[PDB]
Structure 1
Amino acid sequence: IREERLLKVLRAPHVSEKASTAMEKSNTIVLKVAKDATKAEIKAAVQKLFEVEVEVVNTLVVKGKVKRHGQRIGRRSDWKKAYVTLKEGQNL
């Protein structure tokens, strides 16, 4: 896998109460990733850019909402959430 592809995948950390709870239960980091990222690219990117080990990645596609800004109708962009399961022997 080409490394400069891995440098473009992981867009943003995603924090919420569900991500808090998922970190407490099954120590999963929740990432905003690129729209076209597959699970192998995300696993290799977290294993390289964060120097940790990943067990498994579960990716879902969030569809953007439709908003009314000043009686003009727009639609927010879709994005991809990724639940990344850090390994049990890795402790933080």
Structure 2
Amino acid sequence: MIREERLLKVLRAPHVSEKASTAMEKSNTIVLKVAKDATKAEIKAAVQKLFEVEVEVVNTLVVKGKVRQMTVRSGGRVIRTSGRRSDWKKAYVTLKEGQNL
């Protein structure tokens, strides 16, 4: 069985978008950001425990980060820097009949 500390780790944030809002209002589906190494069983247990709702099924995907470019000044001189935003995991959690936040 999954320990409670793991469950308190795996849930990162609710994900806000019009796709997420439409999913909630159509299919009773909750979209979250989760830890990149969280399995579907872990997400199911975490939602069922920390949110006190009953979960039907979890769908997950990994989002690759984009390249972001911005400048940093280093000793009276602006230099252009480039780097990639970190990947993250998105969970589509379908609720049986409960209401969430």
Whether these two folds match at TM > 0.5 is yes
Q: Percent identity?
A: 97
* TM-aligned CA distance change 1:3 to 1:21, over 3 Å: same
Separation (CA, whole Å) in 2 of partners of 1:32 and 1:69:
34
Separation (CA, whole Å) in 2 of partners of 1:28 and 1:71:
50
Number of residue-to-residue matches in the alignment: 91
Separation (CA, whole Å) in 2 of partners of 1:83 and 1:70:
46
TM-score by length of 2: 0.81
* TM-aligned CA distance change 1:50 to 1:66, over 3 Å: same
| Higher gyration radius (CA) | 2
Deviation of 1:91 after TM superposition, in Å, equals 8.3
Contact 1:13/1:30 (<8 A) preserved:
yes
TM-score by length of 1: 0.88
Q: Which runs of 5+ in 2 are unaligned?
A: 78-82
RMSD: 3.3
Q: Which runs of 5+ in 1 are unaligned?
A: none
* TM-aligned CA distance change 1:53 to 1:65, over 3 Å: same
Separation (CA, whole Å) in 2 of partners of 1:70 and 1:24:
52
Aligned residue number for residue 85 of structure 1: 94
Separation (CA, whole Å) in 1 of partners of 2:61 and 2:6:
20
* TM-aligned CA distance change 1:24 to 1:5, over 3 Å: same
Separation (CA, whole Å) in 1 of partners of 2:22 and 2:89:
20
* TM-aligned CA distance change 1:75 to 1:25, over 3 Å: same
Aligned residue number for residue 63 of structure 1: 64
